Ligand binder design. Structure first.
Ligand SMILES: OC[C@H]1O[C@@H](O[C@H]2[C@H](O)[C@@H](O)[C@H](O[C@H]3[C@H](O)[C@@H](O)[C@H](O[C@H]4[C@H](O)[C@@H](O)[C@H](O[C@H]5[C@H](O)[C@@H](O)[C@H](O[C@H]6[C@H](O)[C@@H](O)[C@H](O[C@H]7[C@H](O)[C@@H](O)[C@H](O[C@H]8[C@H](O)[C@@H](O)[C@H](O[C@H]9[C@H](O)[C@@H](O)[C@H](O)O[C@@H]9CO)O[C@@H]8CO)O[C@@H]7CO)O[C@@H]6CO)O[C@@H]5CO)O[C@@H]4CO)O[C@@H]3CO)O[C@@H]2CO)[C@H](O)[C@@H](O)[C@@H]1O
Ligand SMILES: *[C@@H]1O[C@H](CO)[C@@H](O)[C@H](O)[C@H]1NC(C)=O
Ligand SMILES: *[C@@H]1O[C@H](CO)[C@@H](O)[C@H](O)[C@H]1NC(C)=O
Ligand SMILES: [Co+2]
Ligand SMILES: [Co+2]
Ligand SMILES: [Co+2]
Length: 434
């Protein structure tokens, strides 16, 4: 797609800290950009939509290539349309925003310049952030994560995409998502099938795969930390059901692992660690600091700080695994005790280390889940299982929770706030900000 300017595109600024092993931190200035799927897609020389409701224009978009030639992405009114605001080092995303039409949440990328994504090399480093999840009920997910996206959003590889990072192109994740309207400088109209329940969405013949590091998937009830390896490390197109993931009938379509090696302390048995109020180790009614460290072995360490008190990731015992480090032994034990082979099939932490050794783009999102109502995060899943099924219970939410239309109607003022991002060598991010 190309870019159009009927609405100007001004990325909300966002600062973050780059910390050094020598003990100091220096402020960086970036900004955030909304993903292309949220945008108005229209004809390059008129205001006629190329996509509207859940369907493509059959005249403007008779095929993927003609569609991309005919169509452009336009600018976003971040606050008024998308409920996205920033202040200094803080980013807020509202759940439901009403303008000319309804909007639900956002997916945002951290930029280096107005036309390029910021890339982070996670290996050997740590990432720290503050989060307020207090306004996130059952069924919602405020996510902060990394994906192996191109810094230009795909432009150099696919010149028929001239919109680029400035317009939030080039997304990929371990689901190999097929809901994206543009992939590799081509539309995704070929094979398009509208969703059953989401008025704005469908699934196309192409998907977009890449490695994914889910630092934070959470609401006020549950939180998870999850690496996802892919056999191709960076962004790569996939064909139909060969994509696997959420948007295919068979979720195991090779290249990517859509499940990951997940660590949810509640799922692992510590049901008192994270939740609303003073009965939990971490009180989710209050802001909390989350630090995630990527040691060169490929293992992942985690600690939290709230009110000046520090807690390592809680210990878990699973089969022959015992500890609090997300390592090979954990992931292998998890597959043995909970089931599945996707993470190991895709190469486990060794394959994942290829992603963290390279550049990844920071993503912050707020979403609800049309495919599984977020039950995999905060409830019992699948819902016919009981507590006797190892790993079935992931949180205290009802198995009836998280119906998107219901949570959107009941909790429209839900929101997530991410703030105080700090990045640098392991051991460096607790030092004074600049
Ligand atoms: O006409 C003329 C006119 O115009 C105007 O303008 C206008 C126009 O017209 C129009 O068009 C427009 O419209 C627009 C609007 O505005 C807006 O609002 C919209 O938006 C929308 C869109 O459309 C769509 O597309 C979207 O969609 C979305 C959805 O909703 C959501 O949901 C999604 O979300 C996502 C997110 O984001 C992310 O973040 C995520 O990610 C994730 C991943 O994927 C994964 O991988 C992970 O997770 C995972 C984990 O890790 C694992 O572990 C798990 O596993 C599990 C499993 O599952 C199970 O099975 C087991 O058992 O267990 C295990 C363990 O646990 O899983 C999980 C899951 O997978 O992580 C991460 C993070 O979280 O994802 C998600 C999903 O996908 O997204 C999407 C997108 O992509 O939405 C939106 C919002 O609503 O749009 C439209 C268009 O279309 O408008 C405009 C304005 O108004 C003008 O103005 C004028 O002037 C004219 O006249
Ligand atoms: C949960 O984790 C906290 C922090 O490590 C610990 O103090 C507590 O004993 C754990 N509770 C259970 C039931 O494992
Ligand atoms: C839940 O249902 C699935 C089939 O949908 C089945 O494989 C599984 O055995 C069921 N679990 C229980 C505990 O009955
Ligand atoms: Co309309
Ligand atoms: Co194709
Ligand atoms: Co270690």
């Amino acid at each position: 797609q190309s870019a159009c300017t009927l609405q100007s595109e001004t990325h909300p600024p966002l600062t973050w800290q780059k910390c050094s092993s020598g003990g100091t931190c220096t402020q960086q200035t970036g900004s955030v950009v909304i993903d292309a799927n949220w945008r108005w897609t229209h004809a390059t020389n008129s205001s006629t939509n190329c996509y509207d409701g859940n369907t493509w224009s059959s005249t403007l978009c008779p095929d993927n290539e003609t569609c991309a030639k005919n169509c452009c992405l336009d600018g976003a009114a971040y606050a008024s349309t998308y409920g996205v605001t920033t202040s200094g080092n803080s980013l807020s995303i509202d759940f439901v925003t009403q303008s000319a039409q309804k909007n639900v949440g956002a997916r945002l990328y951290l930029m280096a310049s107005d036309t390029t994504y910021q890339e982070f090399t996670l290996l050997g480093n740590e990432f720290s952030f503050d989060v307020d999840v207090s306004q996130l009920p059952c069924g919602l997910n405020g996510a902060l994560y990394f994906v192996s996206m191109d810094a230009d959003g795909g432009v150099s590889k696919y010149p028929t995409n001239t919109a680029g990072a400035k317009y939030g192109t080039g997304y990929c994740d371990s689901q190999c998502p097929r809901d994206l309207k543009f992939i590799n400088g081509q539309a995704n109209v070929e094979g398009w099938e509208p969703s059953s329940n989401n008025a704005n969405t469908g699934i196309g013949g192409h998907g977009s795969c890449c490695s994914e590091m889910d630092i934070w998937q959470a609401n006020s009830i549950s939180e998870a930390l999850t690496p996802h390896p892919c056999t191709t490390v960076g962004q790569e197109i996939c064909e139909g059901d060969g994509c696997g993931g959420t948007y295919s009938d068979n979720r195991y379509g090779g290249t990517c692992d859509p499940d990951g090696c997940d660590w949810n302390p509640y799922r692992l048995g510590n049901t008192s660690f994270y939740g609303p109020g003073s009965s939990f180790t971490l009180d989710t009614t209050k802001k909390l600091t989350v630090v995630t460290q990527f040691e060169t072995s490929g293992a992942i360490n985690r600690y939290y700080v709230q009110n000046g008190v520090t807690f390592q990731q809680p210990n878990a015992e699973l089969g022959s695994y015992s500890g609090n480090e997300l390592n090979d032994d954990y992931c292998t034990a998890e597959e043995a005790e909970f089931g599945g082979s996707s993470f190991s099939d895709k190469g486990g932490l060794t394959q994942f280390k290829k992603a963290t050794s390279g550049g990844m783009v920071l993503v912050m999102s707020l979403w609800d889940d049309y495919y599984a109502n977020m039950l995999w995060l905060d409830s019992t899943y699948p819902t016919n299982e009981t507590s006797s099924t190892p790993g079935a219970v992931r949180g205290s939410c009802s198995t009836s929770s998280g119906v998107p239309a219901q949570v959107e109607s009941q909790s429209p003022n839900a929101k997530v706030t991410f703030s105080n991002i700090k990045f640098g060598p392991i051991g460096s991010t607790g030092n004074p900000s600049g």
